[PDB]
């Protein structure tokens, strides 16, 4: 029952009832707003919650799943980079997790810069890419590694990891089992990082908008947002959040498109239903 067809119905109606509430409106105090006649956001409907917003001219939210602080954004537009980069490196960045494919990337029409596989300068800031590691996540789906070292005068330099799911598919979903492996090793790699700054003495590990793990496919709702609920259920801290928290909470936090398709919703009532928890707020 708890898993069932009624209990995924009523957990779906929430969930439409809350987009439909969250849908922006013209100029909505909700939501970021462009400065003029520059882009800010690669689809007019998929926009960036205000009060949550990690830079003014990024779509880029601070989310706050249970215990697990994240920020989900969309892949930066071309005129975006150095801001993007400004981001990464002032957020002390754990890691980062770039879902959109190297197909993806390589489409042209698709305006995805590849901004992290090579090296290149934007405006005042240099940036170099070195490959790490490739980890494999099942189905042959690969996790490829890279560290980007961030350099520019006035600032410390800051090396960020990506992990970078090369071969993600172009239309389908993962399974639950890569989204758990994806999250194991983004987690993990986090870990790692944040260890690094601790024991150099950070002051961003007292900071809660630092030292978070920064996610983007190309719109940051879909596989994003699959992921970060995913990672949410893999933080021992959150015992008794339900499915509906979580989607809520990603939603009030960026917008409410957030897991954007019922195939990825399916992945997260898989992973949930493993673990026992709730669909459901009673």
Same mark, same amino acid.
């Given at each position: 029952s708890p898993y069932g067809p009624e209990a995924r119905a009523? %957990?779906?109606?929430?969930?439409?009832?809350? !987009?439909?509430? %969250?849908?922006?409106?013209?100029?909505?105090? !909700?939501?970021?707003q462009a400065c003029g006649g520059e882009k800010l956001n690669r689809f007019r409907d998929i926009q960036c919650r205000r009060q949550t917003a990690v830079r003014a001219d990024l779509n880029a939210?601070?989310?706050?799943?249970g215990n697990t602080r994240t920020i989900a954004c969309q892949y930066?537009?071309?005129?975006?980079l150095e801001s993007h980069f400004r981001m990464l490196a002032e957020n002390r960045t754990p890691v980062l997790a770039v879902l959109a494919s190297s197909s993806e990337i390589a489409n042209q029409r698709f305006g995805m810069p590849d901004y992290?596989?090579?090296?290149?300068?934007?405006?005042?800031i240099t940036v170099e890419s070195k490959m790490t590691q490739q980890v494999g996540l099942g189905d042959g789906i690969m996790a490829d590694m890279y560290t980007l070292t961030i350099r520019e005068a006035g600032q410390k330099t800051i090396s960020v990891p990506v992990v970078h799911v090369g071969n993600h598919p172009d239309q389908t979903a993962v399974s639950s089992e890569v989204t758990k492996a994806l999250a194991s090793l983004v987690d993990q790699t986090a870990e790692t990082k944040r260890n690094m700054y601790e024991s150099k003495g950070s002051s961003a590990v007292a900071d809660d908008s630092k030292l978070r793990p920064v996610i983007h496919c190309r719109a940051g709702v879909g596989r994003t947002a699959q992921l970060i609920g995913a990672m949410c259920m893999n933080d021992s801290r959150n015992s008794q959040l339900s499915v509906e928290d979580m989607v809520s909470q990603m939603r009030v936090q960026r917008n409410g498109i957030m897991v954007q398709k019922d195939e990825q919703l399916d992945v997260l009532i898989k992973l949930a239903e493993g673990q026992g928890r709730p669909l459901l707020n009673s």
């Open positions: 009523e %957990l779906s109606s929430r969930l439409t009832t809350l !987009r439909n509430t %969250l849908a922006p409106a013209t100029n909505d105090p !909700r939501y970021l939210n601070y989310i706050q799943v930066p537009l071309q005129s975006q992290f596989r090579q090296s290149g300068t934007y405006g005042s």
